[PDB]
């Protein structure tokens, strides 16, 4: 029948004392959040970093996503370049035309149920566009940085030096890496995957409509992979996991019916989402938004 939402993942609202060091804070919430595989962190209300990207120079070519492509089992889609403004106008027009109502009036539960119906629907073909893996080096980070390429107002300095600035997260693993940008739209999505080297990942939503997340704890990772390889198409069964997780999209209720724990959440503007080592995660955007993510080491 209709989609059944997984239980909600933990939300943390640290005080200013607990918000000092991200690594220490993440270490303290670990015994809980590691059981859900993902968690949400709302910074104190007075923490409000400005958006540091250069908007007039921001240009990208998003990738075409067909929601039902796996159910359908190369001239279909014509790819186009956007600015931030022109993408937002296209994104907002798509959502309001699809649901026949203003974009901010569409309930998050309604986009969720419709997304998973469209994923499995062979009767309807919905095409969206996903701003994807845009390096922060070209346009600059969404956070103010001290690199000296622009700005840094006096009010901006504390955010450029903040440990919660994603450019300041430690990227280096001990042995004998820059943030990435995502311009989202309804329904654009990321499928089930883990980070390289089972790394942590932290994700910040600068502005826009929410990003919906699903996540699985690391102790269930093998269970997810077994259900995946069981129900995945045969041609992709023998593919290595690095190539497999490009196409692996599965209704969370299907995982839950096989006993795999799955947790959900809606990441709104100004909120962090942390994924723990080897925690499988997936999701989709509710609408036009801008997100920044980096893999970090502890
Ligand atoms: C740290 C960013 N990155 C690139 C690093 N790779 C070079 C390893 C990733 O793969 C992260 N995984 C993709 C992803 C996207 C989104 C999104 N579109 O909001 C949410 C969660 N995960
Ligand atoms: Mn990820």
From Swiss-Prot:
Which residues of this UniProt protein bind Fe cation? 193, 195, 281
Q: What sequence ranges are listed for the domain JmjC?
A: 158-298
Q: Where is the JmjN domain?
A: 9-50
Q: Where is this motif: GSGFP motif?
A: 140-144
What highest taxon heads this organism's lineage?
Eukaryota
Cellular compartments annotated: Nucleus, Nucleolus; Nucleus
Which of this chain's residues are annotated to bind 2-oxoglutarate? 130, 201, 203, 211
What family does the database annotate?
A: Belongs to the JARID1 histone demethylase family.
Which disorder is it connected to? A chromosomal aberration involving KDM5A has been found in M5 type acute myeloid leukemia. Translocation t(11;12)(p15;p13) with NUP98.
Q: How does it assemble?
A: Interacts with SUZ12; the interaction is direct. Interacts with the viral protein-binding domain of RB1. Interacts with ESR1, MYC, MYCN and LMO2. Interacts with HDAC1; this interaction impairs histone deacetylation by HDAC1. Interacts with BMAL1 and CLOCK. Interacts (via PHD-type 1 zinc finger) with histone H3 unmodified at 'Lys-4' and (via PHD-type 3 zinc finger) with histone H3 di- and trimethylated at 'Lys-4'.
Q: What is known of its domains?
A: The GSGFP motif is required for the interaction with SUZ12. The ARID domain specifically binds to the CCGCCC motif and is required for the lysine-specific histone demethylase activity. The PHD-type 3 zinc finger is required for the interaction with histone H3 di- and trimethylated at 'Lys-4'.
The free-text function statement in the UniProt record for this protein reads:
Histone demethylase that specifically demethylates 'Lys-4' of histone H3, thereby playing a central role in histone code. Does not demethylate histone H3 'Lys-9', H3 'Lys-27', H3 'Lys-36', H3 'Lys-79' or H4 'Lys-20'. Demethylates trimethylated and dimethylated but not monomethylated H3 'Lys-4'. Regulates specific gene transcription through DNA-binding on 5'-CCGCCC-3' motif. May stimulate transcription mediated by nuclear receptors. Involved in transcriptional regulation of Hox proteins during cell differentiation. May participate in transcriptional repression of cytokines such as CXCL12.
Name of the featured protein: Lysine-specific demethylase 5A
The gene for this chain is KDM5A
């Amino acid at each position: 029948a209709e989609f059944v939402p997984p239980p909600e993942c933990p939300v943390f609202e640290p005080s200013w004392e607990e918000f000092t060091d991200p690594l220490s804070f993440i270490g303290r919430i670990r015994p809980l959040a590691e059981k859900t595989g993902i968690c949400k962190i709302r910074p104190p209300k007075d923490w409000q970093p400005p958006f540091a990207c250069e908007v007039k120079s921001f240009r990208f070519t998003p990738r075409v996503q067909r929601l039902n492509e796996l159910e359908a089992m190369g001239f279909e889609q014509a790819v186009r370049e956007y600015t931030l403004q022109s993408f937002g106008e296209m994104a907002d027009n798509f959502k309001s035309d699809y649901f026949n109502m203003p974009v901010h009036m569409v309930p998050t539960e309604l986009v969720e149920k419709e997304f998973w119906r469209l994923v499995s629907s062979i009767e309807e073909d919905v095409i969206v566009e996903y701003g994807a893996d845009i390096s922060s080096k070209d346009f600059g980070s969404g956070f103010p940085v001290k690199d000296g390429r622009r700005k840094i107002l006096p009010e901006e300095e504390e955010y450029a030096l903040s440990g919660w600035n994603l450019n300041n997260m430690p990227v280096l693993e001990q042995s004998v890496k820059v943030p990435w940008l995502y311009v989202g739209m309804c329904f654009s999505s990321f499928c089930w995957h883990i980070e390289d080297h089972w790394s942590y990942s932290i994700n910040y939503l600068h502005w826009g409509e929410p990003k919906t997340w699903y996540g699985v704890p690391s102790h269930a990772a093998e269970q997810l992979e077994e259900v995946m390889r069981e129900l995945a198409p045969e041609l992709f069964e023998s593919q290595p996991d690095l190539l497999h997780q490009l196409v692996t999209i599965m209704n969370p209720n299907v995982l839950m019916e096989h006993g795999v724990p799955v947790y959900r959440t809606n990441q709104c503007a100004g909120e962090f989402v942390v994924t723990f080592p080897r925690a499988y995660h997936s999701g989709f955007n509710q609408g036009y938004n801008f997100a920044e993510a980096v893999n970090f080491c502890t």
